[PDB]
């Protein structure tokens, strides 16, 4: 009973990307000073804070860098008999939508945020969650006050990315800050050797993409998606390839 | 929660009897190639004990 107050951090996703971002940022600003100990969990880690006010001061730090939700309870011990003083617990939950997911948004939710299409990627994850349309570049933000009233899931994790090989890049010529809408022509790693089946897709990977270069991407065709929000889409409007990022083997 | 106390004393009030092992056990579950022959084997030997020995 020496702990006397606790912050409980959890993220439900099996590959915790934003949560590993939290542990390196907390070491940088040295926010963990008043810790009694650190105990791991199945889904995250626990912080045991001796005085109440130090536990609250972490949550003011947690609001600035990561989208959270929190609530508190209490427990009863032994009441020094000066008129009086309960043992508290703070349960902080990170938004599970990672930095580089694929997301099918709800229709009513997507209609408000700039009338973006339902089939977008994740962008930046900051304090607020940012979504980017990969085909025609347009950004939209989701705050935790809007997310937690109607929660949903990501459509694919990091472990569904597929190695591709870029054939050539054609720049259409419209951009904000990302050399946007390069009409990339790209083919699979498995089918470049023995086949000619070539995929043809716009992407945000404009300036950082070159010919003879390996990119990772979400592949909607063979892979098995199961979302009800995805099911109420128009299947002949969904792009086949969503180009995500690049490997770029730097040095040996 | 769970305990097995008094559970042996309940079952040994009416005892533990055997399933009493009848003559002519049922051929359901015996091999069907054998059952198809053994249908005809009893048929001839009931005819043969009808006319010959009487």
């Amino acid at each position: 009973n020496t702990w006397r107050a606790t912050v409980q951090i959890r993220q439900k996703v099996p590959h915790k990307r934003t949560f590993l971002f939290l542990e390196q940022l907390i070491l940088k600003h040295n926010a963990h000073v008043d810790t009694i100990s650190i105990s791991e969990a199945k889904d995250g880690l626990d912080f045991f804070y001796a005085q109440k006010n130090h536990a609250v001061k972490m949550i003011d730090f947690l609001n600035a860098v990561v989208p959270i939700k929190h609530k508190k309870s209490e427990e009863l011990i032994s009441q020094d008999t000066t008129g009086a003083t309960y043992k508290f617990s703070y349960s902080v939950e990170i938004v599970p939508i990672c930095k580089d997911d694929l997301v099918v948004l709800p229709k009513k939710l997507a209609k408000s945020m700039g009338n973006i299409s339902q089939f977008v990627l994740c962008s930046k994850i900051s304090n607020t969650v940012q979504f980017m349309d990969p085909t025609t570049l347009q950004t939209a933000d989701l705050s935790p006050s809007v997310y937690w009233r109607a929660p949903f899931n990501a459509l694919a994790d990091v472990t569904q990315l597929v190695e591709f090989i870029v054939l050539d890049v054609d720049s259409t010529g419209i951009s904000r800050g990302n050399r946007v809408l390069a009409d990339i022509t790209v083919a699979r790693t498995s089918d470049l050797g023995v086949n000619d089946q070539v995929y043809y897709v716009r992407s945000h990977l404009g300036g950082i993409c070159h010919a003879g270069d390996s990119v990772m991407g979400y592949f909607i065709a063979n892979s098995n998606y199961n979302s009800d929000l995805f099911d109420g889409l128009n299947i002949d409007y969904v792009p086949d390839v969503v180009l995500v990022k690049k490997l770029y083997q730097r040095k040996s | 929660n769970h305990t097995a106390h008094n559970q042996t004393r309940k079952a040994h009030r009416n005892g533990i009897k055997k399933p009493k092992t009848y003559k002519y056990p049922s051929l359901k579950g015996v091999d069907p190639k054998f059952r198809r022959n053994h249908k005809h084997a009893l048929h001839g030997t009931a005819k043969a004990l009808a006319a010959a020995k009487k």
């Binding site: 063979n222 892979s223 998606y225 199961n226 009800d228 | -």
Partner: protein, 97 residues
């Protein structure tokens, strides 16, 4: 995943009694036909002191999809299916592996 569009499977059809060649498509909904028997105590007894009768579904942790591999025989053309698994997308034809 992937399945073929063409499939040599069994026929039970008073003439074939053998395996003939069959054709594959997917699962499509055309109008649910409320000559179906449960939609005119709806269009009877909805319209009432009693009001909107039939309940809906909401507890939507539901996930999967009906994935149809049909066997359209090129020889006789009638109707008894084949099965798949708990599966999430289904395209057919391309990406032979």
């Amino acid at each position: 995943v992937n399945v073929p569009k063409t499939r040599k499977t069994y026929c039970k059809g008073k003439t074939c009694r053998k395996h003939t060649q069959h054709k594959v498509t997917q699962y499509k909904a055309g109008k649910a036909s409320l000559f179906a028997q449960g939609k005119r105590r709806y269009d009877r007894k909805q319209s009432g002191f009693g009001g909107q009768t039939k309940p809906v579904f909401h507890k939507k942790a539901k996930t999967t999809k009906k994935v149809v591999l049909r066997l359209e025989c090129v020889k006789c053309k009638t109707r008894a299916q084949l099965t798949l698994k708990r599966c999430k997308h289904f395209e057919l034809g391309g990406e032979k592996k």
